[PDB]
Every structure is written in structure tokens, then in C-alpha cells.
Amino acid sequence: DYRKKLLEHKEIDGRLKELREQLKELTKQYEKSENDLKALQSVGQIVGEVLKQLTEEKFIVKATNGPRYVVGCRRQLDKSKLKPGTRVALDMTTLTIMRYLPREVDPLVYNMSHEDPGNVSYSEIGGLSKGCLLYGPPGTGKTLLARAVASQLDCNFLKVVSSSIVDKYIGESARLIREMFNYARDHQPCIIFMDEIDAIGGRRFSEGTSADREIQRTLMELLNQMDGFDTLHRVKMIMATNRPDTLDPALLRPGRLDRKIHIDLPNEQARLDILKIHAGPITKHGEIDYEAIVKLSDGFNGADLRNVCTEAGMFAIRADHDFVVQEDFMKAVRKVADSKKLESK
Amino acid sequence: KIMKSEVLRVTHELQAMKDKIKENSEKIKVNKTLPYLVSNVIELLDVDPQRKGKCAVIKTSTRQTYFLPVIGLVDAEKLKPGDLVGVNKDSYLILETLPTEYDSRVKAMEVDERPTEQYSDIGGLDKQIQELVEAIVLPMNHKEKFENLGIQPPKGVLMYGPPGTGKTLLARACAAQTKATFLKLAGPQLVQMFIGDGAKLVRDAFALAKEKAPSIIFIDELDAIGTKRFKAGDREVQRTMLELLNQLDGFQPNTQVKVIAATNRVDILDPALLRSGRLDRKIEFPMPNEEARARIMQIHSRKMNVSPDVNYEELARCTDDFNGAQCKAVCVEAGMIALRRGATELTHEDYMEGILEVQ
Amino acid sequence: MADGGSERADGRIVKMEVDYSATVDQRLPECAKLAKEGRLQEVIETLLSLEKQTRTASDMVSTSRILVAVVKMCYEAKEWDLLNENIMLLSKRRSQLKQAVAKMVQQCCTYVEEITDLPIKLRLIDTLRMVTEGKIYVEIERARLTKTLATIKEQNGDVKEAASILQELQVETYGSMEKKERVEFILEQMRLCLAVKDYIRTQIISKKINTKFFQEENTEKLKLKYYNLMIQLDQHEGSYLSICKHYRAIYDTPCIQAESEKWQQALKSVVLYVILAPFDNEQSDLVHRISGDKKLEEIPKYKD
Fold first, then answer.
1. Where along the chain is ATP bound (chain A)?
2. Backbone angles phi, psi at A265, to 5 degrees
3. Which residues of C199-208 are buried (b: 16+ CB within 10 A; e: fewer)?
4. Of A89, B53, B95, B294, which has the fewest CB atoms closer than 10 Å, so is most exposed?
């Protein structure tokens, strides 16, 4: 009688205290709406540029539209940013200065905006314990590793695509080799990725045309800036490719590509580890046997092992069963992997 | 329950807030009614040293540059360098941002809602088309089960084979089953007179696929531009093409709308087209035999008044090393001269008459 | 393919049991062409991880009972890149080279305690020239041989090699990324400095000591002991300012170890750096870093 009323009143108090969370969470957004409505009241600002300063308090501005004006100094800001050569902002009323406007560029936004998240990818590369060569044996995942450390820190996102040395016009790409590598020499930290270098890695065995001679000339600038008269002790380049046969044996000197990392699945612990990190979110029957999958798989591709395992999940989902036995894993990784061996020419 | 009696005052304050938000939330309709012009937005992060640094660069349509910080409502897909943003008369604030087109010559490439033909128009290809029918049905309805199994569907399927096999009308026939928006695109369309057009076409394809609703983008004649040359125009198509592959390799959020491709020949096979997001599904579509050609010609000719005395042996013998769309042209030609033949019923000589007529 | 050299390896280890060094001279042409062939990158790695164990196993059998070591040191001392001179395509392996040098220093480590005083000076004087002739290494064994020789030079009474070990240390510490080994090997900088006592050398080396290291990625169990062993010779060479910035960072020493013995050293030197502190600025603010600690008032010098 008395002992039950405390628990029952605790239940009424529970269902009474469980209704506040449905409102007090969205009231912060509702008040944030009026906060923004009070934040949109600062309107009517224009821009300008500073060329010549006569008086320390009042100087000449140059508007983007073309007409020039002269403005004063606001009591809040100081003469630090007031020096000439810095783009500033103006107001329509009294031509006061609220703050400045830092300059930028179009490709600089692309070079300073792309960021890939994910910190576990550095530990999801599997059992893997002045230049690096990532060649293309029957094993993939170089993009997951370069993008795994690149997604971890990379200290930047200075990605160098092999399609950026096209130079449709006259082959003066030396301005881009010295411009971008001059940016690498300017910025103290820098990491360079060179993915799919086989397209620009022509062996120039026969007499090359004007299209090949300019790319090989950019390779001559690479020679002159790797083993020429310029050291690269602090900067690092990652040469990724697909076929380790046409990789410019002149560029295969150990002066640049110190070590060789064969992206494969040789070790049983590496194949089992990558199989377990790709087999994370998969559900299956309690009967687990990964030693047959790891043992029967010999020299395969990592991301394509993910595609073969998910392909076995599609083969198992054809019969719309929630649980997935490992029979379709052994026979579907077996048969589909044998189809990859057929298409592995 | 005496300590829980103060909750009533809190609920009265909250319902009073819901009673008082109707006015300041009501002026949203009269202040945010209509942006009178269109102004381009360029994102540029500033630093104030709350007093936090946040700003943006504005450019009006009349070539006038002004100053304004990043303002407005809760932004999720905003903050990108896009156009068609909300703006008042002279306050020049950002109120309603929506991504815009222009250069309609690429935006209205192939505006198709849904086609007429379906997957039940062919015969003898279920063993190889069933994988694609699954690969377009299960990623559209079974998205819930993709979290229990941790499955991400591939975005690049290589529908390769000899020409004339119907690799376009059949993928469109499956696009009728996709129920999504169908959007064609031709290979040579990337080769333009001006420089940098291919970047605008590719970023336009991923602009409508990324921005728009779940759709279907089927391209064809990719082999005509997929040449791996070692100046050269196909190296410019290596700039645009390798740019597209960079947008299929460096973009992990590419789990959105797929990109279906079809090549009429695999002579110049780009080795860099092997990846989970890239053209990994390589299902070979050979030339249909006389049996399969009689099947697709029978189901494609099941509407015309065909004579019942067809043993398929004469047409099976005449159809040697032919393709699907060729027998479709034989069916259409038979439906063309069968009208002027007087007999409303399709005869048996019209098969070889069309075969020797157009070929 | 290594399948041809594997049979010669596992068969050679069985057939080579009692034969003298002449059969090794007969093996020199059998292994010269075997090292010249095998252009495969990842396949011949087993052949280089077996043949080297066959020839070094024959070196173990030759060094087991009787050893003159003259012809032994002449074979390797005169034949280093004989197989690397005909091959124009350097496979840039650097995979079995670390196992090569590490296995050589392992066998020399099993033969380095007490065997015969004569060949050790020529073998070590050879390998320290191999340090200079290498120019490409992880900088582990190159420091290992010269510090395990320097330890013998400590009791040998010849301190002339200090310029050698400390001159080669600069090369052995730049060009690679060493976190643990750099701190374990950096004590040689001020190890022989008690016997050398060169002021300009101290000026070169706390400068080269405190380049980039504050707390992390270096665990020793005595880190503070080596701190006291590294900022004591700078106090020996300096007069007062050397400890002003040192005794302000030993406040974590009582937190790491027992606080019983910290009263005699840490809480004794907690007042000396602020007494010897400059009168301009550091005295004004540095007196507040020690004020507030409960252990400060317990010192009888608190009134001072």
C-alpha cells in the first residue's frame, strides 16, 4: 500500500520528466532563429583597395567598380592592418572601415579547402608494419593508404594529379614544375602525391612526337630537380602507378625511390587483418571460418577483395536472407575471385 | 511529487515561447518573400583577431562587388561558390541559397522523365542482365539492409560489347525499372572548341547528380574518347577523363547516384578504370546468336500481326553475325513495307526482304 | 626464380659440414652468377635470405674451432660489390641489406666478448671505414659498432677517439627519424666530455642536444637522471645562468618518483635558480611559480 505509492509516484514523475527533452532541445534552435535575425542587421558594407597613403589617419581607397574615394580611420581598429597593400572593406554611410578583406585565388580555394576526415583509416591499412614508389602488382589499396595518412594528418592536402601536366598550349610546363615545387620549397611542410604516373611515364623508346617530347621534358625537369642542383631532403613525393614495367628505368634510380612497397596481400596476417576490417559491419551466421577465405585467396586486390566479399553479400541477398552463411563466401569468393583471375590479364 | 510541481511553470514558459514565435517567425514570409536579383557568391574565410572571423565575397550580376559576412539560417549544403542566392534591395544579405544552372546547353542535355520500353522486351539475356536488374533494384529499395550488412553499391558498371547490340535501349529499358530520372550523355560532347569545357560538363554531371534527387545517368560511346595516348586531343580527354576518375576516386561521399557507362569496343582499354567506384562490373555482352536474335525479334515483333507459320529456321539461317538493333531494324522495316504489301498480316519473306534490303 | 637457388641452399647446408674453406672458394663462382641472376624483385628475396645464411653458416663452421681470421677478413674486406659491379640495373632492394649488416654485427656480437685480441682491431677498424663507405643506412648498426668500440676505449685509456665518435655522431643523427635510439645513443655526447672538457665542443653538442625535444615520444625511466647528467657539465662550464632555465623544469621530478629524496635536491635547488635569476624581469614573475606550494613553507630556508 505505502511501499507501492513511492514507485508509482516515481513513475508519474518519470513520465513527467521525460517530456521536457522533446521541447528544451528545439527551443535552443528557436532562440537561435532570433539570434540570427539579430545577426543579419549588419548590412550595407562595400569593399576597396589601398594603393597610396598620404595621411596616417586618412588614406585613399580604390573601389572594385572603378571610382576611387578617400576614407578615415575608425576608433576601434589600429594602424597595423591600415598599412597600404591590404584589401579592406568600407561602409556606404560615412565611409567607415569595419575590417579588412584578405586576398586569396580561384585554384587556391581548391588547394586550401579539400579535407578528408577519418583517423581510423591510418590503422585500417592492414598488417603493414626522398620518394616512395607505389607500384601495381596484383593487390590494390594504395589510394586507401595514401588517403589514409592523408586523411589522418598529411599536414596539408597538396594532391598532384597526373592530368595537371597536360599543357594544351606550348609545352612550357616548367613554370608549373618550378611554380608548384617552388611552393613546396616555400612552405616548410609539404607532402606530394603522384597517383597514376604510368600515363606520364612513357619510356620514350622510339622517336617520340611533340606530345611525348614535352612530357619527357617535364621528366627532364624532374631529373634536374631531383638529382640535378636542388636537394629534396624535407619534401616527400609518393609515385603511385599501375604497372611496374614501364616505370622509366632512368627514374627507377635508388637516389629518388629509396624503398619499394609492393601493395599486395602476401602475409596471412595481413590478408586476415584486411579481411576483418572489411568484415566489420557485415552480419553472418555464428559459424565463422576465415582461414579458408584467407588460404584460398592468393595474390588478390584489397579493395577488389572488398568488392568480392560484398559481391558475396549480394549473392546471399539474392535469396533475401538476413543471416548469411559462409558457404556463399567460400563459393562466391572462390568463383568470383576466379573470374578476377580470368580478367587479371 | 512536490519537487516535480515546478515543471508546470517550465511548460508554461515553453508554450508561451511557442505562442510568441508566431510574430517574429511570421515576418520571415514578408522579409524573405522574393530575392529581386541574382548574385554570385564566392566563399572566403576571414579572421577577426565571441569575435570570430567569418566572411564571404559577393559578386552581383551587374558586376558590382560588395562586402558582407556569412549570414542566414542554418546552412548544410551552402557555403559553396554557387549562384541564385537570396538578396534584398540594398541590404545585400543572404536569405535563401539555392544552386543554379545557366549555360542551359549542357543542363538540358537529355531531359527524359521515364521511357516506354521495359526489361521484358528482350529474350535470352536474363543470365547476364539479372545481375544489373538486381544492381539497380536492390540499391534503390533495400537501403535499410545496407547497414546491417555494411554494403555500398558500386558506382561504375561497364556495359561493353560489340556495337549494334542495343546497349543503349536496353540500359534505358532497365532505367524504366529504376523509376528514377533518366539523363543521357554522349562521349563526343566533352570535346568542345573552348578550353576547360570538360570540367564544366563533368562538374555539371555531378552537380545534377549530387544536387538533384536520386536519378539515373547513362552514358555511351565512352570508348570513342577513352584513348590512352602516350599535342593530342585525347590527352585533353585524359585531363577531363582523369578528372572524372579523380571524382570517382578521391570522393568518399560518392555513395550517391550511380554513373552507368557503356563502350562499343574494348580495343583501347584504360587500365585505370578498375576500382570499387569505377567501372568494376565488367559483364561481357557478346553478339546474340540466331536463337537470341529470334527471341528479341519475337518479343520486339509480338505487336505486329505476324503469321503463325514461322519456324524461325529460314530467318535463323539468314541472320548470320548480326546484332540486336539490326534485327530491330529488320522488324521496323517489315512494319514499313508490310503496310504497302497489301496484306495486313506479316509474311515470312519480309524477314529476308528486310535483311537484304537494309543489309 | 629462387627455386633454383633454394635447392642449392638447403642442399648446400647439408653437404657443407666438415669441408675446409677451399670448398667456399669453389662456391664463389657458384654464388657469383647466382647473385648476378634473378632480376625478380620479390621472388629472389628468399634466395638472398638463404644463400647469405649458407655462406655465413660456413663462416660459423670455419670460425667454430680454429680461426686465423686473416683470410676471413680479406674475403669480405676485398670482396664487397664484386657482384654489384657487373649488374647495371640496381634493384634498389635495401631489404636484405639490413639483415646482412644486422647479422654481421650479430655474429661479431657473439665473437666480440673474448676470442682473440688480434682480429678485433682490424675487423672494427674495417667496419668503421664501412660506416663511411656505406652512406646509406638506418643509422643503427653504424652507431652500434662505434659505441661498443667506444665503451672499450673508455677503459682502454685512449680518449683520442672522442673526435671520431662525436664527429660521426652528427652524421649518425641526421638524415633519419629516430625517437628511442636517438636518446639512448645521445648520452655519448657528454659521456666522454668529462675526459675531454672542450668548451667549444660543449657549445656545439647543448645546442645540438636540445634542438627538438620537450617531453613526448622518448621514455627512459630515468629521463630526469639524464637531465641532471646533461645540465651539470653546462653548469661546470657556465657559472650561474645555465641552471636558471633548468631548475624551473624539474618540478615534475617529484611527481614521477618518490618525494622522500626530492627534499634534499629538488626543494634545495628550487631556490637557487630564482636567487641567481636576473634582476630585470625573471625575478618579478619567476617568484610566483614557486609561491603557493605547500612544500615550500616546510623548508627552513623559506624565511630566507
1. 136-143
2. -130, 60
3. eebbeebbee
4. B53
